[model samples]
Target: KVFGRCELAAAMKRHGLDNYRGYSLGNWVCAAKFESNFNTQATNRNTDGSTDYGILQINSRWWCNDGRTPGSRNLCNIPCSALLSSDITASVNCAKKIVSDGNGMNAWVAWRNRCKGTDVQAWIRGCRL
Candidate 1:
């Protein structure tokens, strides 16, 4: 886990996620807190058997390939396991593509439910840009 929010912000900036694809840095930070708490290895299965991967919790249904899921569109053309890496570049790029597809941060349930309209400044408090 990140030592604090500042560390996460720095990582996001390093990955070119600061104000990326029209979304603010705070949006990414808040979403990360709910999605995976900044844990790259995080994974979770949904009731429909679709698994979410990595810090962004990208789904296998449309974003990435996971052998367990058949007929996945794999829009990101990336392996789900790749999202589980500490190196977040791929995941960040995929997320940008997803946003470009028009969902924006709304693509993530966490963003819709928690980060949207919330006080997101807390997510980046004391974090150097």
Candidate 2:
């Protein structure tokens, strides 16, 4: 599912992306924007034999287990396929756990180069359900 600006904002907010780990909702919004363009089914494979999954682009190498990554931690304890679902609940929950695990928002380089220190507020501006 591809979520619009406000739609994604509202959805994420409902799931507690507002201030999870002191990162603003806009930060998450921008991260998702640049990472996967708000598409829940997005996936990208790395040369390390791990695949990034879903809107936040969680990796299989350490986050979720795809059963193809030679040695994955599967920290989230869920199948990578679940991260690809249009229903972003799993992705959101995994994301929170990933952050709480000390990965921080730096987990996404897309967020650092694009969203970090930017006017992330723009992502949440006028974005209400």
Candidate 3:
């Protein structure tokens, strides 16, 4: 779904992710902007031949299956398309699972490269959740 920052913040709070897993809402919002610009249907083909799916860009190699990757673990056990839906519930659950699995937000290279150590207050600057 295409959500504005405040819309996303409210949704994240509803999902109990405003301050989830030791990360702030800013971290999640900043990561989402860089990862997929809040577009639920976003997908990208990584250089490694694995694809990233949905808003958080969950990797096909480890999180979901595109049915073509050679050895995807499918840890979320969900079809890759499920993450592309506007509902976002499945994606949120899977993302939380990923964080709990020890990857934290570092699992997203975009988060590590672009959001980590950055001042991302503006990502939720006007959100009143």
Ranking by lDDT: 2, 3, 1
TM-score of each: 0.93, 0.96, 0.94
Judging by lDDT against the true structure, name the best candidate.
Answer: 2
lDDT of each: 0.85, 0.90, 0.87
Candidate 1's C-alpha runs over 4 A off are 1-3
Q: What is the per-residue lDDT of model 2 for residues 1-129, given as tens digits with 9 covering 90 to 100?
A: 898988989999999889999998999999999999999899999988899999999999998988899867898999999988878899999999988876698888998899989999999899654
Superior candidate under TM-score, 1 versus 2 = 2
lDDT against true structure, model 3: 0.87
The TM-score between candidate 1 and the true structure equals 0.93
* Candidate 2 TM-score, true structure as reference: 0.96
Quote the positional error of residue 30 for candidate 2 in Å.
Answer: 0.2
Can you rank all candidates by TM-score, best first?
Answer: 2, 3, 1
| Number of residue pairs clashing in candidate 3, backbone atoms closer than 3 angstroms, sequence gap of 3 or more or interchain | 0
Backbone collision tally, model 2:
0
